Write a protein that binds this DNA or RNA. Structure first.
Lengths: 64, 92, 133, 347, 358, 90, 61, 128
RNA sequence: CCUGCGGCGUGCACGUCCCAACUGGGACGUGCACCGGCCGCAGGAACAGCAACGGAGCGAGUUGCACGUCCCAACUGGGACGUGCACACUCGCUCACACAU
């Protein structure tokens, strides 16, 4: 789709239609992956996310 | 058909087959509300009202043998006085 | 023109194992050499996912540049469970050119056939040696 | 940073959990109260009460509707009730606040929350410069007339701010960020921005980037996270992922003015009693009559939302009375014991 | 450990006791400043839900009970400025305390439809001007001008400009600048209300032995209101009204207009119960049985402000009881009404229901 | 008729003959002034200075010149054209 | 006109007849712009001021 | 110099001409002065001509204070589609208009004599 | 007795014309502001009450999406066959009627 984005030093979303950000790195698409309730790939996604350290729990906790 | 008519506003610009008119009377027109000329000649119906609550515009869908290039700068348009509401109604 | 050392840098953090440049030439040749038999090479996320689910053996080639990752992050693990070797490619557009469709596909399923038995075996062996992180 | 056993006072007051933050900055009416062993801290509730008193900041997918993304969460979490506080169109992504069970009581209070969208608009014809679009967006500001897209009761809604984030001339497709009041239709706004610029235009993509005080940086989680968290809980009995995904409802009332009440007043308020001055442990500067406030226990929980019937100065200058009437009780009854009628008089 | 982890694992509950409950009211707005430091007569009353805080009123009442510190433009007269504000804001009444001549800019406090009752009380306010003068013939040196100014610091003699010779005071004065080539100087003067600074310039000229006259004048302060105290221009008033009538925005109008209580922050305060507000409005004297708090230092025949617990200036009164007497008494009239500011029926009629009254 | 001592010559601001005042009474506007020999030299033009120690500038006719008077020259004024000081005091 | 001023560190007005302040910056005129009651440029005045962060609502306090 | 003068200007002094564009603007004003009715000088005349509908280019001086005397005219120009650009000082405008007295703002119409320079300046401004 | 209200041709701004700055000059029309005591009207005659008998929680009224299977010509849009999923008042029930040591 059209809406893509990159991040600044503060980790804030800068919205653009450009495929390459100012710093040369690719822009991440702004829309989440399509969801289907009958999805039986919870275990597999956890395995891969954990392997590469992208799980929510692995990130630093918030400061609420 | 129009028993009476009052000046809705003056001319604005053109957006494809529509004629934006800047409305001077505070009252907010109705939708699908006939816009007539001075001589009670129906030209079109209101389609969209946009802008602030006291300086706003209205787009009309010229229909029965009428054109956007027909009208010209500084032209004025009329509307049925009964097809209006008070600004207060729409506002809080 | 884009190099091979910067294009790889453009991929995501989950694109491992990532075929080196020589192995990249090999996989593109294998896909081009296999595009021939229409029904012996599958294309598409849904198609590859379906064939993996019903359990079709072969090699699964992923695209390094994918975002959001949640559309295909589950496929590496399924391939690992079913003992179906897989690897990532530096860029999706390269794969699209490999099939000559001009529309890069995220994933491709390459099966085995006599016409390209040697190239398929070499690529599979190289991929197995590369290892899984 | 802090050793696990450091005293709570060793951490500055500006780093407390979500409704006790800056409690020392509040006006203290009295410190003397008898703490009770009941209740739980907002973030240390069991997993069975965390889900019931929690909300999710879901990044809505593209295709499904908002009522279908909320039914999905209810089915996934096996919760009795689930609601949301603003409807995102079936083709529109962005933030969506999904309240779980006991948190749904706040849905109404979240309806008037100011929203922030990022919209993509395609213009039928071309403009000479981006300055034209910037000026057009400038004049599409303030209170504006809007018609719901395909009731038809022309309404007036406010665009507080806007900013053309990008524009592609060859495509004639632009991206603009808009701060607007709840109920604003950005589809109609794009049509009106097209009409104003003399070329026409339409909205081809939308994404809500903030809904009230909640945004994309503030703990936004995809539906995959909710599904994955439930699977981890059922098949692994791990509540780390589930606690990351679900946040306590107190995070929706952090911007509300606070009136801390004693542990002896919580249950009375839960039964419909009005907040009374003799039970106020602390109150916050800036409380005006007819202002929605949050009643908070001494552990940080949200007893109820109330309407203030006494200003901060009035509380500071009175010894008794009705400091606030109830608007919506959040806490369940019998969480704290019945301890009303045992005051200094008890006559 | 991260602060988030400590928050999720720590107790973080308010401590059961601290033994002290001191209030810090030094930052509360307008007539609630240092509200805790006021002597507390009683804490027992039933507040009423009628009324608003001065700064959190609706827009209609906020405008109706407001004032503007306006940078007067050079050309028009003060009455023109007052009438222009009236036409812009569409208000029934408007007034001002001090009159600036047609060519004089500076501070100009304009009241709006209920602060007009405070115009008389603002007439005696001190005034600071900054005035430009030209001397007919050159002087020896600047020290001569400084000495000449130092000789016009007192209960000076001033006759109005173009005839009842009066006496008006000049508390302070300073020669801010003096250009010798053009013989033009700028001096800042603190003075009492009614002083005609053009007369002062001609007198300063006479004192120097060469004569002189005033070219410009700019009021830099009228009472407790000055250039930094939220002064706004006429364009600001017009723009604020337009933003409220077109975009239905009130923030601009709230920055322009200020609550009338901002004019009464220098007065000693007597807070009264919400049952005594309507009595005071109708003319009842401020009786002791309904006083919550008072400011120490109140003397007999002193101007004080009767205020509600919300911070609203009910009235201006003249005390008939000292602070010591008000602490040591149980009955008797604490103050006598001088100017009722609050509108009647803003609070309900609750006089006559007490124990002794019945 | 009679006269009383107004003060002495202090300086001169153009035509105006500024007379310092030693009395505690403030004269009127255009009040005529006269010398020792009861010869009128002008009328009061302006009355400035501090409340007590103050001065008066007087406009003279065409037959008299401001420089015509030397330093210390004393002036006489009418005792029937004076106001009480207590009137102008607050 | 004659009067002008420059702002010291504390924020007070320092009045002077000079065109250039001791710091080298221009001295701001003391007098406000003339006012016409029939001024039809309120919209145009809030747009420009808002664009440059000069409007009263945009300042602190 | 030039950078210093732009430093002294007010915050609403945008878009601003650089040194080269400033020389072009002064040359344009100097050339346009030869024709009485084809150059408009002063606040009142420029404002009145904009109201009536006159076209051309409006050049402002950024060193003016208070800004409420001209803050609205940039928006009026935008509404009527009149290019405009600020310059460092008013004395420079005055010096280019054959008058030591400064000029707060000026408006230049199109004449065949200086069509090329007026069109160069218009293009340069429109690209800013 | 107390309170509130009312009475007891100069300049300014705008528009239009002549001349020789953020201007001063002239003319023509618009609007706008100015050159302590007594009386009349209206409100009230005020010692400033009220530490719970109206609150809360439930229930009712006032086409798209996902999956699977096939045809065809990207993280796709099309069709078909089936699966599941979404589309302020009153009226009743219950709880207490709470000034929080």
């Amino acid at each position: 789709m059209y809406l893509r984005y990159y991040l600044n030093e503060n980790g804030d979303r800068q919205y653009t239609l450009a495929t390459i950000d100012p710093y040369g790195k690719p822009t991440i698409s702004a829309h989440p992956a399509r969801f289907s309730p009958e999805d039986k790939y919870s275990r597999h996604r956890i395995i891969i996310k954990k392997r590469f350290g992208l799980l929510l729990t692995q990130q630093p906790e918030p400061i609420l | 058909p129009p028993e009476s008519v009052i000046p809705l506003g003056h001319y604005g610009w053109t957006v494809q087959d529509d004629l934006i008119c800047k409305v001077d009377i505070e009252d907010v027109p109705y939708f699908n509300a006939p816009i007539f000329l001075e001589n009670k000649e129906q030209i079109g119906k209101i389609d969209e009202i946009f802008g602030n609550l006291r300086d706003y515009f209205v787009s009309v869908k010229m229909g029965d043998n009428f054109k956007a290039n027909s009208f010209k700068d500084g032209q004025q348009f009329y509307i049925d006085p009964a097809k209006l509401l008070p600004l207060k109604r729409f506002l809080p | 023109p884009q190099s091979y050392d910067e294009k790889v840098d453009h991929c995501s953090v989950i694109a491992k194992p990532m075929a080196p440049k020589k192995l990249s030439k090999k996989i593109y040749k294998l896909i081009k050499k296999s595009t021939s038999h229409k029904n012996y090479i599958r294309n598409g996320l849904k198609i590859v996912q379906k064939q993996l689910r019903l359990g079709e053996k072969g090699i699964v080639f992923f695209a390094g540049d994918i975002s959001p990752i949640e559309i295909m992050c589950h496929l590496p693990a399924v391939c690992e469970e079913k003992d179906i070797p897989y690897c990532y490619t530096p860029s999706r557009k390269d794969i699209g050119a490999a099939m000559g469709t001009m529309r890069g596909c995220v994933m491709v399923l390459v099966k085995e056939h006599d016409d390209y038995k040697d190239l398929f075996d070499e690529v599979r062996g190289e991929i197995k040696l590369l290892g899984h992180p | 940073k802090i050793e696990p056993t450091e005293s709570v006072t060793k951490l500055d007051t500006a780093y407390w959990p979500l409704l006790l933050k800056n409690f020392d900055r509040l006006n203290v009416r009295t410190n003397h109260y008898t703490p009770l062993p009941f209740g739980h801290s907002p973030l240390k509730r069991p997993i069975a009460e965390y889900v019931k008193a929690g909300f999710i900041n879901v990044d809505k997918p593209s295709n499904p509707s908002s009522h279908e993304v909320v039914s999905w969460i209810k089915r996934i979490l096996k919760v009795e009730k689930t609601g949301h506080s603003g409807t995102l169109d079936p083709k529109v992504t962005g933030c969506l606040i999904v309240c779980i069970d006991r948190a749904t009581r706040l849905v109404k209070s979240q309806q008037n929350a100011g929203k922030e969208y990022v919209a993509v608009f395609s213009l039928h014809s071309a403009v000479e410069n981006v300055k034209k679009v910037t000026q057009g967006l400038e004049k599409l500001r303030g209170a504006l007339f809007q018609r719901p897209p395909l009731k038809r009761q022309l309404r007036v809604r406010s665009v507080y701010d806007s900013k053309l984030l990008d524009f592609d001339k060859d495509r004639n497709i632009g991206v603009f960020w808009v701060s607007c009041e709840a109920g604003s239709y950005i589809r109609t706004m794009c049509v009106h921005l097209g009409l104003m610029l003399g070329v026409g235009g339409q909205m081809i993509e939308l994404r809500r980037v903030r809904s009230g005080i909640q945004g994309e940086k503030e703990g936004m989680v995809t539906m995959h996270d909710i599904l994955d968290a439930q699977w981890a809980y059922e098949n692994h009995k791990d509540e780390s992922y589930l606690r990351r995904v679900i946040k306590p409802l107190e995070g929706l009332l952090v911007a509300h003015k606070r009136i801390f009440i004693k542990d002896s007043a919580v249950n009375a308020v839960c039964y419909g009693a009005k907040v009374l001055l003799p039970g106020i442990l602390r109150y916050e500067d800036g409380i005006e009559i007819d202002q929605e406030i949050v009643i908070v226990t001494t552990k940080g929980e949200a007893v109820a939302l109330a309407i203030a019937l006494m200003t901060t100065s009035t509380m500071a200058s009175c010894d008794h009375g009705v400091a606030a009437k109830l608007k919506r009780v959040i806490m369940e009854r019998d969480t704290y014991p019945r301890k009303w009628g045992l005051g200094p008089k008890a006559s």
